Amino acid sequence: RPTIGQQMETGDQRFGDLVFRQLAPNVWQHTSYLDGAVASNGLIVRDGGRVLVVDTAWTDDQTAQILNWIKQEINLPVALAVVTHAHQDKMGGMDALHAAGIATYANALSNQLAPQEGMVAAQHSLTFAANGWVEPATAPNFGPLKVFYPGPGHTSDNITVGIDGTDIAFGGCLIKDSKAKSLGNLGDADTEHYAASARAFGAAFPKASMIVMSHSAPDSRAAITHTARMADKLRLE
Ligand SMILES: [Cl-]
Ligand SMILES: [Zn+2]
Ligand SMILES: [Zn+2]
């Protein structure tokens, strides 16, 4: 059974109970929902003759449906997935990736925290230099994916990804959009270092003009400065 895409008034395409949006010739945003209802975004990148995934959906079934979409619309093997912190929205579908033979990667800290956060750890751990950049030996054949740990923010373990050859960087749950009224789920957050991490993210990917994030539509760099400003407000109490 194929699924046909259900095009929307916004140009997203519905496929099952997921939404897919093309951001650039070789980059798509994937969106899944949990019940109110709550959107979570990740990315799919075509890199020559393989596909790379950033984040799962909330569930194994939704993540399986992402894999079906890739099979049906791109038709290339998924070489690896990178997940950006240890919460359900980002790591809730690991078993589906593992069932499909996909090699998975996460911050070593994300893997250490996963059992406590109710998550399945990834198979491989990314480690980071003191300047925040991924150690290249721990992220082999990541193609255009540039992984950067900006410091504690939304969580202690949150990491971020830039896409070489595009103007796209993925803030994950660290960044919120330019109209956001708060910083959201602050249960696991570092209120002291959040602002510095958000600015570190901006400095790490200075040529990114499209900032993709977990919980709203892509936004400009205004999301970065807006998030930092809200993070400062908070730190001063
Ligand atoms: Cl599940
Ligand atoms: Zn989170
Ligand atoms: Zn989240």
220 Cα to the center of ligand 1, angstroms: 32
Which ligand number lies closest to the CA of residue 40? 3
Q: Which residues of 51-69 are buried (b: 16+ CB within 10 A; e: fewer)?
A: bbbbbbbbbbebbbbbbbb
Does 89 show up as a binding residue in the annotation? yes
Does 173 show up as a binding residue in the annotation? yes
Question: What is the spatial distance between Cα 191 and Cα 200, in angstroms, rounded to a whole number?
Answer: 15
Structural Rg of the chain based on CA atoms = 16
Question: What is the spatial distance between Cα 20 and Cα 69, in angstroms, rounded to a whole number?
Answer: 9
Does 158 show up as a binding residue in the annotation? no
173 Cα to the center of ligand 1, angstroms: 20
Contact status, residue 124 vs residue 143, Cβ threshold 8 Å = no
Which ligand number lies closest to the CA of residue 188? 2
Q: If you ran DSSP here, which 8-state letter would residue 197 be given?
A: H
Question: What is the spatial distance between Cα 97 and Cα 227, in angstroms, rounded to a whole number?
Answer: 32
- Give the environment of ion ligand 2: residues with CB less than 5 A: 87, 173
> What's the distance, CA 81 to chain centroid?
10
60 Cα to the center of ligand 1, angstroms: 4
Resolution (A): 2.6
The domains located in the chain, with CATH, are 1-237 (3.60.15.10)
Contact status, residue 173 vs residue 214, Cβ threshold 8 Å = yes
For 59-62, the CB contacts below 8 A with 24+ separation are: 59/32, 59/34, 59/92, 59/93, 60/92, 60/93, 60/95, 60/96, 60/99, 61/96, 62/17, 62/18, 62/32, 62/92, 62/93
Sheet holding 145-148, edge to edge: 145-148, 160-163, 168-172, 210-213
What stretches of 65-185 adopt beta strand conformation (E)? 78-83, 103-107, 124-126, 145-148, 160-163, 168-172
Question: What is the spatial distance between Cα 203 and Cα 36, in angstroms, rounded to a whole number?
Answer: 35
Does 185 show up as a binding residue in the annotation? yes
Question: What is the spatial distance between Cα 13 and Cα 23, in angstroms, rounded to a whole number?
Answer: 12
